[PDB]
Amino acid sequence: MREIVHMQAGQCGNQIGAKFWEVISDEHGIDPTGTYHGDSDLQLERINVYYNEATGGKYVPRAVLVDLEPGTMDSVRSGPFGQIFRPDNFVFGQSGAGNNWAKGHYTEGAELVDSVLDVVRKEAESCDCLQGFQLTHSLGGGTGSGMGTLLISKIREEYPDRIMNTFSVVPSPKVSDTVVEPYNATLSVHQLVENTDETYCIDNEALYDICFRTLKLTTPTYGDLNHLVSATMSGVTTCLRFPGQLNADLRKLAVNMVPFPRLHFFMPGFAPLTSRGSQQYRALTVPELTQQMFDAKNMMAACDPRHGRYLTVAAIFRGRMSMKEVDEQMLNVQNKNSSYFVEWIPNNVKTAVCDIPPRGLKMSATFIGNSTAIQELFKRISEQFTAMFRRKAFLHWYTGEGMDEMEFTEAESNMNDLVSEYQQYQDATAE
């Protein structure tokens, strides 16, 4: 059986990973102390994808938590579902990243990266088939950006065949919350490009938007944001753990989803999302699942999908459905607006129907979208980066940490080349 090794990097990555293990532990009937209080054989059938078998009935998560501060990892260990992890794959440093990509990638994240490679190598060699790696971080700081990209590069050099998905919370200009955030994003997107096989770009302002206008909720809170991100992550990887009519692994998603290798930035989704008042006023059906999943609100990136063209769409359904209705709804949402679809790729929709809907739901669905509207995100990142870099603002940290303004310029040139590639792939005619 195949395996996924989880890697949480940074504060945001550690919080999202803790919530992710919290949701896939009671998706699999795993109590906080580690045993299996399930109620079906199907939960225990495919538990080795994420949980290593240990002493007794204790199923230990196969995740490595990294951070260059004794902060959020102490928070995870103290919080609920924090005792499932081994005390060995909690590698962390007493220093500080300083929200500095140079410190995270070259300076004091490089003396612990060898220990992280030791731990991840130990888990990967203890795996049986090792389908690939799942890494969660953010392009807005130190440990998330620099340490995470160093980890992705080293794992890519060690195993240049296995699947690599990185989720990553992309910076927002409205949320902000960090000043050197455009530098940390611009200097790390390029390092993501040639290493990650697929990246499911998450955005905080889009999470706030879907909480505001779909789940109401008044006060959304990072806990609910992490629950929603973890729900979409579990919807992405549900086909490895539950049997279904029409299976699709991460490799099938990549092969049917990314057309050209530097086009692997996706728009995730999920569409059972009703307010508490409006939960009982909707007859949960495949048509409204499809239309909510293809609604422009439900996308978790700030880029609007009507401003570009969908290169590919993947939709992973969970529950018991009818394949005629599923395929008919996919065809209908393609045919009503085929204008927001590339003409040179006929039938760019990849359906994956699996059984066993998530706990407490009749039927669910999750979305992955490769569209050319994702160039706008990098354009806003670029226009912030050049505004800060034109006056050499905040560059003394990066320069005195041992970097180059020519390296900054070449990272910017790489991101503009990627933007131009998306632009011409959008504007390419059928023949």
């Binding site: 490009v193 040639e194 050209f260 290798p261 530097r262 080349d417 011409q424």
Partner: peptide, 26 residues
């Protein structure tokens, strides 16, 4: 700006596939 259409068309004929190989044969 370089024509990525013809770039990838020649790259798959040269047998490069991965994105690092793409950028190095650029």
């Amino acid at each position: 700006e370089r024509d990525f259409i013809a770039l990838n068309k020649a790259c798959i004929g040269a047998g490069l596939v991965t994105a690092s190989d793409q950028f190095q044969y650029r």
